[PDB]
């Protein structure tokens, strides 16, 4: 009688293979708006 080869493997070692890690390098870049003027004067300095 022959010895049949053992084929046997569990759910852990079939499903939980070491997975490829996600490729994450993405920051949230924000652009600062340029500054707005102080063209502002007071009545004393514009009339007197």
């Amino acid at each position: 009688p022959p010895t049949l080869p053992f084929h046997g493997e569990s759910a852990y070692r079939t499903d939980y293979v070491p997975k490829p890690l996600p490729e994450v390098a993405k920051p949230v870049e924000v652009k600062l708006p340029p500054t707005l003027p102080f063209n502002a004067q007071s009545c004393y300095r514009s009339e007197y």
Partner: protein, 426 residues
């Protein structure tokens, strides 16, 4: 860790366990010279459940060979997978019980039981401590029901909380070999009902009907019949040796199947079982594994389960398979065979999946189930007992060896009320 001490007694026990250790060695990659082949990690991480290191790399079984005549012990050693056993685990008799429960239990089974309590305690205390004992023997012959029955007795008070698996073959209704059939049955069922945690029922014609109507094998040998039982009794303990998604041991099988501690008699099935010419024509998935599962021809118990009621059933599934295919198939066979299952236990059915299948098969499943349809064996052995007890037939062989007949009526009492308790649950 967990360790199962296999005990086998009598000619039929030794022959049926030669096929048992044949399939366990094959499943675990064990050369009959003890060494290992098969280069798989899943083979050997749970090998102490049935084997032991023997400082030579080889694995000797934890098997206690027992017979009271040296006939078949020479044949089991001379056969294939026969040199795997330790010679000291054999115990040799010289007279042999001549199909006599009396002298096999009282007058000459007493001197050999001291030399075999040396070896069952040697295997028990050699490890850290064990899980259970499985005993394979006959209840129709003399050396099985006389000698192994008493071994079952004193291993209770030395290890009370340990599980006791036991596979027993029974006297047959139609053919009657070993002409004193019911005396060796009734006297040992008394012992077995109060000194066994769980017992599994095998019949010779039930094996012959499997070999004829399902396997279509014209010439059945005793090794062929032993292969069927041995394949069944490896499936009941798959999860002890292999992992799975849902694991279960002998204690899981016990606590779910016995609700009342005195009735522990089970029916055994095994699937798949194809013809050699019908293997390639038949599909292999859980809906047809479970529909061959509940068939009267499929059992190795010669009682029609439609005549009774399924008190509790369980299935040791094996192989990679969908968990909810198993779930849907148990629930379907309950609510469709509604009259076949008892009402007062909701969802009578238990399941366990052992991820690694047996060799050459993608999937398999093994039945262990308490049924009240075993009652028609208990009264069939009973009225065959009292038909020839009333006439004082063959009593002089028993009462002369040390027996008195006060345990003959009170075995009839302690078996007719097994019939009584199994009656009202259908």
């Amino acid at each position: 860790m967990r360790e199962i001490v296999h005990v086998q007694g009598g000619q039929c026990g030794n022959q049926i366990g030669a096929k048992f250790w044949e399939v366990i060695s094959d499943e675990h990659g064990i050369d009959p010279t003890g060494t290992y082949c098969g280069d798989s990690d899943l083979q050997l991480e749970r090998i102490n459940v049935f084997y032991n290191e023997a400082t030579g790399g080889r694995f000797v079984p934890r098997a206690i060979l027992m017979d009271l005549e040296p006939g078949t012990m020479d044949s089991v050693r001379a056969g294939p997978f026969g040199q795997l056993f330790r010679p000291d685990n054999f115990v040799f008799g010289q007279t042999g019980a001549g199909n006599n429960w009396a002298k096999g239990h009282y007058t000459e089974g007493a001197e050999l039981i001291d030399s075999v309590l040396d070896v069952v305690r040697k295997e028990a205390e050699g490890c850290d401590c064990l899980q259970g004992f499985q005993i394979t023997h006959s209840l129709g012959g003399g050396t099985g029901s006389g000698m192994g029955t008493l071994l079952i007795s004193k291993v209770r008070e030395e290890y009370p909380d340990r599980i006791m698996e036991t596979f027993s073959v029974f006297p047959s209704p139609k053919v009657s070999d070993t002409v004193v059939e019911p005396y060796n049955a009734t006297l040992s069922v008394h012992q077995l009902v109060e000194n066994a945690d769980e017992v599994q029922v095998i019949d010779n014609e039930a094996l012959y009907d499997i070999c004829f109507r399902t396997l279509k094998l014209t010439t059945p040998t005793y090794g062929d019949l032993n292969h069927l039982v041995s394949a069944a009794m490896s499936g009941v303990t798959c999860c002890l040796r292999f992992p799975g998604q849902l694991n279960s041991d002998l204690r899981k099988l016990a606590v779910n199947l016995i609700p009342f501690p005195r009735l522990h008699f089970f029916l055994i099935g095994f699937a798949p079982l194809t013809s050699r010419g019908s293997q390639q024509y038949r599909a292999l998935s859980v809906p047809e594994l479970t529909q061959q599962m509940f068939d009267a021809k499929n059992m190795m118990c010669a009682s029609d389960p439609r005549h009774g009621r399924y008190l509790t059933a369980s299935a040791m599934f094996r192989g990679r398979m969908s968990t909810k295919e198993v779930d849907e198939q148990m629930l379907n066979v309950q609510n469709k065979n509604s009259s076949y299952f008892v009402e007062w236990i909701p969802n009578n059915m238990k399941s366990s999946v052992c991820d690694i299948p047996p060799k050459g098969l993608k999937m398999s499943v093994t039945f262990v189930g308490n049924s009240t349809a075993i009652q028609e064996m208990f009264k069939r052995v009973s009225d065959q007992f009292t038909a020839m007890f009333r006439r004082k037939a063959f009593l002089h062989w028993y009462t002369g060896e040390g027996m008195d007949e006060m345990e003959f009526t009170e075995a009839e009492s302690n078996m007719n009320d097994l019939v009584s308790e199994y009656q009202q649950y259908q």
